[PDB]
Amino acid sequence: DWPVYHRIDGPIVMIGFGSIGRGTLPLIERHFAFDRSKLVVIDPSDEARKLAEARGVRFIQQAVTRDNYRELLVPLLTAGPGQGFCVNLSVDTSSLDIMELARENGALYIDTVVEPWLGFYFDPDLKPEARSNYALRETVLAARRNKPGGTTAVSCCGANPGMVSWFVKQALVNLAADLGVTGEEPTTREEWARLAMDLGVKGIHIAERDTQRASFPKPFDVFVNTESVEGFVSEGLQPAELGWGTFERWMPDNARGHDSGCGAGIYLLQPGANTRVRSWTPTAMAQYGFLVTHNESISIADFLTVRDAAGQAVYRPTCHYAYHPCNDAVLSLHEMFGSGKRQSDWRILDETEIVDGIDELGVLLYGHGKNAYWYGSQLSIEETRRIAPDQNATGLQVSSAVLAGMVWALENPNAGIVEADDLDFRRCLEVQTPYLGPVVGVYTDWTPLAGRPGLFPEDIDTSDPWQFRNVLVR
Amino acid sequence: DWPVYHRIDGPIVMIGFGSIGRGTLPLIERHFAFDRSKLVVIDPSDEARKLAEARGVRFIQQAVTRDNYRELLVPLLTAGPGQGFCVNLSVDTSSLDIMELARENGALYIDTVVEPWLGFYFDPDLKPEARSNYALRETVLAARRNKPGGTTAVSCCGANPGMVSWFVKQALVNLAADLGVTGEEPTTREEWARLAMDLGVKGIHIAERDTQRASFPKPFDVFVNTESVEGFVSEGLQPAELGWGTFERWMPDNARGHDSGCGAGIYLLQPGANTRVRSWTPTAMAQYGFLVTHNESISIADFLTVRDAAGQAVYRPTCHYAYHPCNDAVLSLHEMFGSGKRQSDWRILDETEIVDGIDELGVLLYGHGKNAYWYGSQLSIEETRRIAPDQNATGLQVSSAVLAGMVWALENPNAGIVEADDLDFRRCLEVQTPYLGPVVGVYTDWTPLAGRPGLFPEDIDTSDPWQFRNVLVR
Ligand SMILES: NC(=O)c1ccc[n+]([C@@H]2O[C@H](COP(=O)([O-])OP(=O)(O)OC[C@H]3O[C@@H](n4cnc5c(N)ncnc54)[C@H](O)[C@@H]3O)[C@@H](O)[C@H]2O)c1
Ligand SMILES: NC(=O)c1ccc[n+]([C@@H]2O[C@H](COP(=O)([O-])OP(=O)(O)OC[C@H]3O[C@@H](n4cnc5c(N)ncnc54)[C@H](O)[C@@H]3O)[C@@H](O)[C@H]2O)c1
Structure with missing residues (x-):
């Protein structure tokens, strides 16, 4: 049988249920112990809803935006009983703002890309230097210096x-x-x-x-x-x-x-x-x-x-x-x-x-x-x-x-903001x-x-x- | 009720039996009148031979080289009773030399490219300018100046x-x-x-x-x-x-x-x-x-x-x-x-x-x-x-x-060396x-x-x- 590495005794918030979310959720149910109702999926698409409903998992058909991400996510992240895990597998969302939101609410966090709020990629007024991943990455490095240590947040895993x-x-x-x-x-x-x-x-x-x-x-x-x-x-x-x-x-x-x-x-x-x-x-x-x-x-x-x-x-x-x-x-x-x-x-x-x-x-x-x-x-x-x-x-x-980033984070839950190179x-x-x-x-x-x-x-x-x-x- | 445009009162020598040769042979048979035994295909490939054998068409399995094209094509193109037609649809053969040979013996000629003898394209001793189609076309233009008029030969049709x-x-x-x-x-x-x-x-x-x-x-x-x-x-x-x-x-x-x-x-x-x-x-x-x-x-x-x-x-x-x-x-x-x-x-x-x-x-x-x-x-x-x-x-x-170029050549047999622009x-x-x-x-x-x-x-x-x-x- 497959190994169950840890028990997650808190909410599991999956932001985005696209090609990667569809593949990650089965692996989370396989290798982690938790009550199925503690998981919640957030995505604006009707296609994602029908898939989530086919899995019998709580679904919120909503786009996480700069205007609503605090009001929307903070209740989900602090629902308890224990420590929650935010699994960000979306587009058009700011990885940095959500990451900082989870950290200051004591919730672990993982994503696969430094994504900006919708509009950044095609913003006509940004210089090519500010449109680079170097600049986006420097916003996460700046955050790590401004707030060293703390709740683990795995960037780009x-x-x-x-x-x-x-x-x-x-x-x-x-x-x-x-x-x-x-x-x-x-x-x-x-x-x-x-x-x-x-x-x-x-x-x-x-x-x-x-x-x-x-x-x-x-x-x-x-x-x-x-x-x-x-x-x-x-x-x-x-x-x-x-x-x-x-x-x-x-x-x-x-x-x-x-x-x-x-x-x-x-x-x-x-x-x-x-x-x-x-x-x-x-x-x-x-x-x-x-x-x-x-x-x-x-x-x-x-x-x-x-x-x-x-x-x-x-x-x-x-x-x-x-x-x-x-x-x-x-x-x-x-x-x-x-x-x-x-x-x-x-x-x-x-x-x-x-x-x-x-x-x-x-x-x-x-x-x-x-x-x-x-x-x-x-x-x-x-x-x-x-x-x-x-x-x-x-x-x-x-x-x-x-899956491996989530396992490492549960085993190292107070390592602060980390990249794959730090794992x-x-x-x-x-x-x-x-x-x-x-x-x-x-x-x-x-x-x-x-x-x-x-x-x-x-x-x-x-x-x-x-x-x-x-x-x-x- | 396909139209038969012309009678060809001489040998029809088709050099090459690749994709274009295979598509052109049926159109020649369809649109021109001639004794079946007058048409012969020349191509060194074994796959080509089996195809031609299955069409009941004469086939000579030989590569047309610089050292044999005179003793091979001259007798074939002058077999009589009148004017033959050289249909060149091959690679690795010199269009110019074969064209001048046809004109020298009063046979009509057509090709779809100014091709050089084998070894030209990848010769390391040639400057890029010498490997240009501009350079190749200039050899045809010079041949026309040196021998104006004469038997029609259609280049790159x-x-x-x-x-x-x-x-x-x-x-x-x-x-x-x-x-x-x-x-x-x-x-x-x-x-x-x-x-x-x-x-x-x-x-x-x-x-x-x-x-x-x-x-x-x-x-x-x-x-x-x-x-x-x-x-x-x-x-x-x-x-x-x-x-x-x-x-x-x-x-x-x-x-x-x-x-x-x-x-x-x-x-x-x-x-x-x-x-x-x-x-x-x-x-x-x-x-x-x-x-x-x-x-x-x-x-x-x-x-x-x-x-x-x-x-x-x-x-x-x-x-x-x-x-x-x-x-x-x-x-x-x-x-x-x-x-x-x-x-x-x-x-x-x-x-x-x-x-x-x-x-x-x-x-x-x-x-x-x-x-x-x-x-x-x-x-x-x-x-x-x-x-x-x-x-x-x-x-x-x-x-x-x-097919179109052959019709024009047969209708205009004394026009000399011509390009598709001249038809x-x-x-x-x-x-x-x-x-x-x-x-x-x-x-x-x-x-x-x-x-x-x-x-x-x-x-x-x-x-x-x-x-x-x-x-x-x-
Ligand atoms: N590092 C890697 O190896 C790697 C590999 C593949 C994908 N990715 C990244 O992972 C992310 C997900 O990839 P995917 O293949 O599932 O993409 P996808 O396009 O298949 O899925 C995107 C999902 O995000 C949802 N979404 C769009 N806007 C949203 C918003 N404002 N709020 C919440 N959800 C929203 C969509 O409805 C969709 O279901 C992508 O951003 C991609 O860049 C990383
Ligand atoms: N102008 C156009 O529209 C146009 C379009 C396609 C092809 N072409 C030209 O037509 C020619 C033939 O095209 P294809 O699709 O039939 O090519 P192909 O590669 O399918 O056939 C080439 C044939 O030439 C034969 N061949 C090779 N060396 C030979 C030699 N020394 N003597 C006699 N035959 C030899 C091969 O056995 C082969 O059957 C090519 O040179 C190509 O550049 C022109």
Whole structure:
């Protein structure tokens, strides 16, 4: 039977019941003990209501807004008897305002993204710098400094951001042994950054390849994806964004830094979902990825930053997304940007519609003695159906990572505001690994200069294959 | 009751039996009168032989090379009793050499491309400018100057290059009439160029959208297309090319002109199949197109050039391909360029495999008073199966254009070396129209500046939306 990790003796408030909420709720009932009536789901859509009613769970058909979130949520969070848990899996809501609301009411909190109130993503008056995830992330870092410690609030604990942070630590451990780097396993942020520096890790790709396919072809004028379309399109239209490593010798003309913050990121003045990079995964081998902005791009580079006594950074890795979505999403991207506007409709591929395919999601560490090393999951839809209901392979990697964040938080309920990089990676993977299918590490001799230059003059840097000048596609 | 247009009183030698050869052979048998034993096919492929054997057609399994084409084609084309016809529908053969050989022995000739001998396209010792279709077309133009007149030989008479030259003439006449400009239509090149100048036609997209899809999904590591894969990938890896209009005020930094020749073209130092442009078709609306180099991009711009007394160009339209192939081909291109290498296998979708779709292929005249006007064919696969065998919608548009060009050559056998721009377009479209499905003209108020600028800074020219500055994706 499945392990029941803890009893939750308080209200469980799930904000948003979309593709990820539908997959997470079954996992919460499976691995936690509690009275079913103590759970409550909040979502404005009629489709979510009918699903919630099919589960016999309390439902409030309401959109959480800046105007109503205090009056709406505080009664739900303080209903008792004990400590409540706010599980935020929504769009169009401010992760920071809800997070702060839960903390000051003594309720645990978890989400999978730093989401802003509706209007932010397309606000015409915001500068590209303020539209970046770097800026959104700095609002959570500022909150953590203004109110250190307290009730635990786990920020950005999905598959990516989230799971991949744990994969980076396990990958670093594996690389140390394989490169025969002597030493004791790191137990602090400073020790981890120092290990990556000592291993010669110049950068990291969040290298992903989704091969799931449906029984019907991509409909015309319909955006298709295996997870949130609204969320993917929104982040796809934000600036391309990456953690900027100290080994880089070149950035493009339309790249910009930040005047304040942790200083670990840059951004390009162009949408990320229409920005290609050269990357690599085990199933796909050499492929194009899209440089979509993610929280872990900034948080991983910042976490693995080494500073001198003066506070200046002397080592940090490059880190960014390299996303090859399912073929219907690639076509949807080609369609959307080719038209200049969102499609008239969208849909998320369901477990009942997907014929085959996997979601290969891992971290690719490069620049070290063995060139490149990819570590991550290869979960298949066949395995997904066999172990978890109401979700495809993309959704299970995410929902299982929310399960591990919830377990860690109940076991560490007074750790303050934390990101996935602050969680005990070994305990989190122990919870999640049953839902990840094969988890493997693989070396490769491939580099972004393979087969280059070709028959056209090209702006490459042959001294160092992994320079961003060689990765970025023009 | 199919019309039989002409008797062919000599040998019919068809070089190549791929997708286009298979679709063209039934049309030759259908529309021309000749003794069955006069037609012979030459193709080195084993798959081709078995097909031809099943049609009861003579087949010589041999590659036409530089070291054998004289001793092979001369006897075959001069077998008598009178004039033969060389139908060249192959890859890796020299169109020019075979064409000059046919003319030297009084045989008519037609092809759909200026193809070089094997080894030319990927030769590392060639500058990009030498690998341009502009350079190839100049060899044909020079051959015409060195031997004016003589036996007719039709260069590049397929769907595009070929049929789209006739669409431009019809579109120009339609635009005039829609403006209330009656009167005698042009009958010389000078008058045609003047008409385009007088109507304010700033440029022309060969605007195409293929919607044919297969009963199976895109297989991994396979390049899929509705026509020649080897032919498509070769031109896709050639530099991007376009006829360069006199109204253009900007070109990229990696754009180059030519020192010699007609002087109508530029090229970019990047592969066309990885270069995107903003265009439009009736069924697709606003879409991305690929800037694949094509012969008609130059010949149309050249044909519609107006010069002053000194010989300098005072008007010329911009002209280039804006190709949106089928979805599997879009995926194939993403896969080929993302990995940096041709796939291990390829296949051309057969009519038995295609489940639905059309080949929407026409010309988009822009810059005039009515903004933009699309004229062309919307042939569907369903109508294709009802009227012609052994081909899909893409192939039928090509084979029927070859049919049209053969009719014109047989009717005008002493015209010398000619391009599709030099043919009687009303007679050619009279022959081809039964195989083009809906042939319609559509006006649109769309421009490349639709919805721009976005949330990012952009280098655009708001005074003239159709400037290549705004069309080219950057
Ligand atoms: N880190 C990761 O790995 C990861 C992976 C997938 C999704 N996500 C994120 O998780 C979130 C949920 O993803 P999903 O696939 O379920 O998205 P989805 O679009 O399928 O679901 C969104 C749900 O939120 C609801 N909603 C919209 N506005 C709301 C409001 N104002 N208040 C309350 N609810 C509202 C909708 O009714 C819908 O049911 C997204 O924001 C996405 O960015 C993260
Ligand atoms: N203008 C147009 O509208 C248009 C459209 C499609 C294709 N084309 C052109 O038509 C040509 C044929 O197209 P397809 O779809 O039939 O291509 P295909 O790849 O389906 O067929 C090519 C054939 O040429 C044969 N071949 C290869 N080397 C040869 C040699 N040395 N001698 C004789 N035969 C040889 C192959 O065996 C093959 O059967 C291509 O060159 C392509 O560029 C033009």
